[PDB]
Structure 1
């Protein structure tokens, strides 16, 4: 059950890397925030679910 924790954590790192690249360029693009709301919220929701998943799966690891 450790392998699922490393997969969840590395997925969290990839999500955070994409967020560091994407959230500023989505914010500062012309009229890009108005059309990328859904993808940014999707990234943040997956990020939060993976943080909670890693935290919970550490209690079983």
Structure 2
């Protein structure tokens, strides 16, 4: 019944691209995305929310 892992495994496939070319590109270049956009507390601080949603299967298996 723990199909939330099946819906949340795509959430790390799309987090293995934001921390690729979402804020760092490949060098010291905040190209209008790391300056005031979704980096600090808006839309890249939910990696703590994604490790919480991957630790929420602690009682879904036990």
TM-score by length of 1: 0.60
Alpha-carbon shift at residue 46 of structure 1 (Å)? 1.7
Aligned partners of 1:59, 1:13: CA distance in 2, in Å?
23
Q: Deviations over 1:6-59 (max 9, x none)?
A: 21232122123222111213x7336744x33x4012333222101111122243
Question: Contact 2:23–2:39 (CA<8 Å) still a contact in 1?
Answer: yes
> 1:52 — aligned with what?
52
Secondary structure at the aligned position of 2:44 is classed as helix
> 1:15 — aligned with what?
15
Change (3 A) 1:31 1:19: closer
Could you say which structure has the greater relative contact order, defined with CA pairs below 8 angstroms and 6 or more residues apart? Answer: 1
Aligned pairs, number: 59
Secondary structure at the aligned position of 1:5 is classed as helix
Q: Which has the higher helix share?
A: 1
